[PDB]
Design a binder for these strands. Structure first.
Length: 226
RNA sequence: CCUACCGCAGUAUAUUCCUAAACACUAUGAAAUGACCCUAGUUGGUCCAUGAUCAUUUGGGUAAAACCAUACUGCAGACAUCU
């Protein structure tokens, strides 16, 4: 019910709106760097520490590709990413903040480095606050993994996203629709709705998306209630 | 009578060619709207015809000296007259 909405004839259906253009150093017509240095700081758990000790230079090399300074201070236990004068991309500092958050949340660096690509996007879901009891929290966290990781793989097959369940956080790296789907699955799993309940619904949704006629109509009649 | 050690002065401590590297010079073309660096400036900093900063190869230069140890060579056995 989009009341009082004007028409948009300038929009073209042939143009791929989902397409993403690359960026270059000459892309900005200002010709000048950022006026103020912008930094993002995160903390990491102590058990990550030594692993970061062995990876950080490589991390710096990755940020050396994107002209972003980085620092890792063990005494505060913090990692900070800073924009530089040679930096020309305004969103790469946000992607570096996502990178250090993913590195703190136990995502390995060969997987975590791909967040610097424009296509990838990450979501960190906090699951410590849903239930207070320890045994129920452990059980519901094991529901996501299941036996031998299998349903977790199914969740990957549900979303085409890298999913890592560590401590109080679920880290998901992938497309935005898969991020929203795995957010739904993780929150409903922490609210004791079983993961297979959403896995079967996602499979039925994919089968309905296979048929364009079913995709035109509502899937709620065909799909079982949950 | 001789030999070795002892004293002092020397020589060698690998040699020749090619090549790699460092430092500096020299030859050629580029200079005052001169060149370089820094989240970078109401005049920032550094170098600069007393040669900066890039090239181009033009060719040659430097990498010692002293001492110890080892091996060899030579010089002398010296209390110093000299009026």
């Amino acid at each position: 019910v989009s009341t009082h909405n004007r028409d948009k004839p300038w929009d073209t259906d042939d143009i791929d709106k989902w397409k993403i253009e690359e960026f270059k150093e000459e892309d900005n017509a200002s010709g000048q760097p950022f006026a103020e240095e912008s930094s993002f700081m995160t903390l990491f758990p102590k058990y990550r520490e030594s692993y970061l000790k062995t990876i950080w230079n490589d991390v710096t090399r990755a940020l050396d590709k994107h002209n972003i300074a980085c620092v890792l201070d063990l005494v505060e236990g913090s990692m900070t990413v800073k924009t530089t004068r040679k930096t020309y991309d305004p969103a790469i500092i946000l992607k570096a903040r996502d990178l250090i958050k993913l590195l703190a949340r136990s995502v390995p660096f060969p997987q975590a480095v791909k967040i610097l690509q424009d296509d990838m996007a990450c979501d960190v879901i906090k699951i410590g606050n849903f239930v207070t009891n320890k045994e129920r929290f452990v059980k519901r966290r094991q529901r996501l993994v299941g036996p031998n990781g299998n349903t977790l793989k199914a969740l990957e097959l549900l979303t085409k996203c890298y999913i890592l369940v560590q401590g109080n956080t679920v880290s998901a790296m992938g497309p935005f629709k898969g991020l929203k789907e795995v957010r739904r699955v993780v929150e409903d799993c922490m609210k004791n709705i079983h993961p297979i309940y959403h896995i079967k619904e996602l499979m039925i949704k994919r089968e309905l998306a296979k048929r364009p006629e079913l995709a035109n109509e509502d899937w709620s009649r065909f799909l079982p209630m949950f």
